[PDB]
Amino acid sequence: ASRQRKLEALIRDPRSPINVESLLDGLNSLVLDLDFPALRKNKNIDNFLNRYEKIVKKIRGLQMKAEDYDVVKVIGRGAFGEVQLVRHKASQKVYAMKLLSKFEMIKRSDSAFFWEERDIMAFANSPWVVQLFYAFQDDRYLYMVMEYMPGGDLVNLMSNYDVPEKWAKFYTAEVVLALDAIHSMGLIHRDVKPDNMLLDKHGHLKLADFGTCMKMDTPDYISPEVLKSQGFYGRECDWWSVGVFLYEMLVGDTPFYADSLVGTYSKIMDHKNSLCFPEDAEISKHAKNLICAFLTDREVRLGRNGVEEIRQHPFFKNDQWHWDNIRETAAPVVPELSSDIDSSNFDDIEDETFPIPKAFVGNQLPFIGFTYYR
Amino acid sequence: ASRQRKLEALIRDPRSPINVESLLDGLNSLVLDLDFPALRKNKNIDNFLNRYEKIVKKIRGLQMKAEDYDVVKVIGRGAFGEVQLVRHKASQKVYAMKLLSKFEMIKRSDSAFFWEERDIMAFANSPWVVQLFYAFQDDRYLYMVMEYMPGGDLVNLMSNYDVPEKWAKFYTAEVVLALDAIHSMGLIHRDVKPDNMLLDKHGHLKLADFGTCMKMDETGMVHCDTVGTPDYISPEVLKSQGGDGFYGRECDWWSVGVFLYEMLVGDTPFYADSLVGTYSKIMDHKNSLCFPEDAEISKHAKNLICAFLTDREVRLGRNGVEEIRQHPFFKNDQWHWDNIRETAAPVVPELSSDIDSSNFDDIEDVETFPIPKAFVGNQLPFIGFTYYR
Ligand SMILES: COc1cccc([C@@H](C)NC(=O)[C@H]2CC[C@H](c3ccncc3)CC2)c1
Ligand SMILES: COc1cccc([C@@H](C)NC(=O)[C@H]2CC[C@H](c3ccncc3)CC2)c1
Ligand SMILES: [Cl-]
């Protein structure tokens, strides 16, 4: 009764490794790993599969899958897959779907990063983090269905407008609160850049792409400790990147730009001397102060002693918004969109399986527990 | 919504292969089959086990297990295990626990029979079938916790009393209704005998041991398997196992013929010193069936036995149970067919405690799977066995 009530609660919990969706993943994965003619020479395997042949087919039909979605356009490419703008066929609702190749993750020794990515987007319950509605999988891919962000990213905005300081104040303030939310969850991002800052239908920021997230105990935006470490470091390394972001928005170039990557690496390490505001750049004293406060050695960097000292910096003083209502004021640039599939703010994009194994190799074991239904 | 409601129903259903207990069995079995040092040289396996190390330990603690029961006495022994009279420690309630060796089942190519046995005892919801409260498993055994029949079996009764025909009428009538219940569930028993007929606290029959149960076809027929203990097997069941013969519910009615003969006469109708002698007498039943001249038996009782102990084609119970029920032998002043189990039994057991096993005869180390070199899947056969009432 009491031991049964504890076991039933462990299964009910959406955070649990033994939720109902995880246990089904265990069954599916096992059937996929076992159902090959050479393995069925084992009586244990063949009998097991005969028993679970029909019911696993019936689950595969009932469960969510890629064929439930029409692909409209490819809106991203990454190391292990792509991002598809999709419409779910039944509901007719539009999402951004991220695909991850199982073969490549196993081939390139990188098949754990997606857990924190899934958890952040699923469970943050935060307006600064892209919401995940569904995670599911086939034999070839992991899928992550997310709220579509039709405003596009800060790279797109920056190339389309000269950003005045009133706007930069706003976007930097929204990045500060997004990072504070990530940090509050016990997480360092490690890859803060405009590419990973997206604007919703109302022109307000959310963070996406949590592939480099780690739970706490491109070279333009990397901090000098992260350069010297080559693998310890803390939340302060994200605050470096906000320093670089604000510089990029106001100046229009990266502060440690060079023709080669080695030139950039060498400038970043020499930041005390190489940080230099151009004499033609329209930038205030307070804005130079904040950038300089972020672009220092880790030991004395702004945000080391919490977010509060970032919030009371004079740069962020203004007549338009407060910190506790910023996301409910009018954004600088409302996207003008023609439809629920308008991907005009995203640039156009242009483009092997596991072998049939001789014995059990367990290629699906890494992905057991990935399925999540909101 | 609708596709989600179908998936949620499949999981809710206690009959389903993908109930919550089955899915947990899948996880446990997988961990047990994979957690060996040589297999963890695979990164997929090692990482998987690291992820599920703590939670599987926590499930093993929470789930029902053999250490939740005190073993009081061994009351049975069988091909693949034994029977323990047990007391559950927390509730203090007494059950009969049947164990089944996983090693032996795999070693001796026989690891499917327990499914129908588990299902019959769990789901029959019938006073003629022993109730199963819990099925669980460890790495070595399947366990089946059922209600304890402190009256013991009809072998025990027959050796302790000269059975008069009024008693034989009663026990045979209770067997007829038990078999009719099994047959109504789409099942042939194939091994009906006194050993498998137990008496509850009130001295009334229930069938136990469903290891030779088969599910019938849409034409009421069944495929060959298993036999041992030849005394009660029918001649079609003898002829079939040589070849690939077919047989139906009528083969259980042969066994009731043999039962009633044993109760009234006191010996088996086809007895011999060797098993081959018994087999030869059963096949020659037209000539070998002979009532001894000193046997106290009625004309009606000889009629019923003879009606059962014939060729399948003309055997009683071929055309349903009703013609068995209207046979004059079963006429009496004490019970009707619809209230038999609620009248006073011939022999109510007087028992001195909840652990009194006086109606069960006294009974007096094991080997495990080797540490495998690769994945062999020894636990895959037993996924879905766990049932909590
Ligand atoms: C590691 O293998 C990858 C495969 C594909 C993409 C990516 C990485 C670089 N890309 C991403 O994470 C996108 C995902 C879609 C997000 C989005 C949400 C809502 N609207 C528009 C975009 C924006 C980040 C990595
Ligand atoms: C095939 O591997 C076997 C392993 C152990 C036992 C058996 C066979 C011979 N034995 C059985 O089925 C028993 C089970 C307990 C029942 C019971 C119920 C309630 N009270 C007392 C006993 C009586 C039948 C077979
Ligand atoms: Cl009657």
Swiss-Prot record, chain B:
Protein name, entry field: Rho-associated protein kinase 2
Region (Interaction with NPM1): 349-389
Entry's localization field: Cytoplasm; Cell membrane; Nucleus; Cytoplasm, Cytoskeleton, Microtubule organizing center, Centrosome
Principal subcellular localization: cytoplasm
Comment block on domains: An interaction between Thr-386 and Asp-25 is essential for kinase activity and dimerization.
Domain of life of the native organism: Eukaryota
GO CC annotations on file: centrosome; cytoplasm; cytoplasmic ribonucleoprotein granule; cytoskeleton; cytosol; nucleus; plasma membrane
Post-translational modification: Dephosphorylation by PTPN11 stimulates its RHOA binding activity. Cleaved by granzyme B during apoptosis. This leads to constitutive activation of the kinase and membrane blebbing.
Location of the AGC-kinase C-terminal domain: 333-389
Sites of Phosphothreonine modification: 386
Originating gene: ROCK2
Residues in Protein kinase domain copies: 69-330
Keywords: ATP-binding, Biological rhythms, Cell membrane, Coiled coil, Cytoplasm, Cytoskeleton, Kinase, Magnesium, Membrane, Metal-binding, Nucleotide-binding, Nucleus, Phosphoprotein, Serine/threonine-protein kinase, Transferase, Zinc, Zinc-finger
Residues annotated to bind ATP: 75-83, 98
Family: Belongs to the protein kinase superfamily. AGC Ser/Thr protein kinase family.
